[PDB]
């Protein structure tokens, strides 16, 4: 009956390369923190619990840490429980490099 | 497709101000941190 | 020839008989692509491969 | 400063009235004028994107 049911429903193209520049900026992590802390009461009581789940991982698979940056690797877990793929410990890959080092601006 | 204002008139420093504090009060500060990333490009390049 | 008190030499940054402490460039005053913000420069090329400002530096090391 | 003067130039009109026409728009001519509407077609106006 209300006439505005596909006018705010069509979808806005042109958004591939507004998907991209948001994964290598650490938007997408940026915005998953949010989203985590979203039910949280008390923020500095949320960072601690997540200070010692990281401290536990590193206890626990120590030989693999240095690189997978625990911190990242607890945050992706608690993301990835209610879908939200978000690859493991947020690592990121070079897919076309026949080189060593990006410029990096 | 977003709930916004569409701008007809000049976005002065005062209007610029103005709208950074609806967006934050109706995103949040992780949808405007991308959002002040976007205007910042478009705005250096006009 | 040359009189009493005249020049003879040239010294470090005296070029002719006179003081000069830089070079004369180019310049446009524009905004680029945000390169130049607030007091920031966006020089060329062509000031490292010339020799535009290039200088000895010299350490005296004492033992 | 600068992404400031961008989005002000980007969000600064057309120019409204006597800087965007000469002469008055009242004018009465240039109507194609005859007893019918079958005359030359231009109308310039604006595009209708």
Known sequence: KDVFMEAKLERVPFLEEQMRKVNEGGGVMAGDIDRLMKSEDNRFAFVNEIAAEATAYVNNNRDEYGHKKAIHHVLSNRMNDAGFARPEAYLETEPFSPGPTYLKE | ?46 | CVKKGQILADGAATVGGELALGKNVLVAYMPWEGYNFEDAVLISERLVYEDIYTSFHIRKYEI | ?49
Not at chain 2, 18 to 40: C, E, N, P, V, W
Not at chain 4, 17 to 28: D, M, Q, S, T
């Open chain 4, 1 to 49: 400063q600068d992404m400031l003067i961008g989005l002000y130039i980007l969000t600064s009109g057309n120019r409204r009235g006597i800087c965007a026409n000469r002469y008055n728009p009242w004018n009465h001519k240039t109507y194609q004028n005859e007893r019918i509407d079958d005359t030359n077609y231009k109308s310039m106006k604006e595009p209708f994107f």
């Open chain 2, 1 to 46: 497709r977003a709930n916004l204002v569409f701008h007809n008139k000049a976005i002065d420093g005062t209007a610029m101000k103005r709208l950074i504090s609806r967006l934050i009060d109706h995103f949040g500060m992780a949808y405007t941190s991308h959002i002040l990333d976007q205007l910042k490009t478009l705005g250096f390049q006009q």
